[PDB]
Design a protein around this ligand. Structure first.
Ligand code: HEM
Ligand code: HEM
Ligand SMILES: [C-]#N
Ligand SMILES: [C-]#N
Lengths: 138, 138
């Protein structure tokens, strides 16, 4: 359907990482920003997920990527509003934001995930964290 | 005990917002950074929590601040590693990171929370989020 055209228009060049999987968890869209970023980080990511091929991403099922794919599968299948969480990707830390997406006829197209790098914030936290616990007890 | 001295030394001037409550949820420490920041944001915060008095913070019980204080109370009481979440504070968005803290004799002193502003990231997410859902269905 032409939902796909509207999507490319609105997101293709926006500043955010954006990716969409269908109801089968098949990647059916990814914007330029996220495409560039996953390109660079491929080797680093491969250390974590040996199967990750950046160039083989469209069409891909994202189960491969998930520790227990059954868990996202359920999660997604019930998502109603936004889900907020974090992931490690290639030793970098991202906040992830997932929302379901629907066509004009309110059918569910799938799920939109948006990744925001927060590696620095996250390392800082780790520091302050151990620094505090070190101080509290020599 | 002198755990308190080591804490002030290590954290008083560090770049992070840091605050510690005891096993009773009484604020027993707050660093300079978080003190300055909560000062500024007091009026904004008061819109959300009418009781919030910035200047009356040491000694304060943080139940007042929590929607169902019973929930953090349980949470904290079982915390073993780090807890990561988010909060609204005075219409600003913060990532929060909570770790238990212990003295030299492994007694539990209480809980250390660290707040990291992510209002901008969070508004961006909201945008991209609705932008996507708008595009997917006119
Ligand atoms: C539309 C695309 C995708 C969606 C909708 C999706 C969905 C999700 C969701 C909902 C979570 C929730 C974590 C939680 O709350 O427990 C998650 C975690 C995670 N995702 Fe994805 N994912 C997608 C693509 C990817 C890709 C491309 C990767 C890696 C290349 C990936 C790797 C991970 C990792 C490492 C986690 C952390 C927990 C785990 O490994 O199971 N995801 N994902
Ligand atoms: C040592 C100090 C504090 C600790 C350890 C503490 C602990 C917590 C924890 C563990 C959560 C978890 C949220 C979740 O996962 O459901 C939370 C949420 C929250 N905290 Fe705190 N808090 C502290 C001080 C404060 C202060 C000073 C405020 C406001 C002035 C505050 C306001 C909130 C708010 C608004 C939430 C969101 C959910 C709710 O309102 O119950 N906290 N807090
Ligand atoms: C998927 N994150
Ligand atoms: C409390 N955050």
């Amino acid at each position: 359907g032409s939902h796909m055209a509207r999507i490319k228009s609105a997101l293709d060049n926006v500043s955010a990482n954006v990716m969409i999987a269908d109801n089968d968890l098949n990647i059916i869209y990814m914007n330029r920003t996220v495409s560039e970023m996953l390109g660079r980080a491929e080797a680093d990511i491969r250390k974590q997920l040996p199967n990750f091929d950046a160039g083989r991403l469209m069409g891909a099922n994202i189960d491969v990527f998930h520790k227990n794919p059954a868990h996202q599968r359920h999660l997604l299948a019930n998502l109603t509003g936004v889900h907020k969480a974090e992931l490690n990707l290639g030793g970098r830390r991202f906040s992830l934001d997932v929302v379901p997406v629907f066509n004009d006829a309110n059918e569910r197209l799938g799920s939109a995930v948006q990744w925001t790098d927060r590696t620095e914030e996250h390392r800082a936290e780790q520091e302050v964290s151990q620094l505090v616990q070190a101080a509290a007890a020599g």
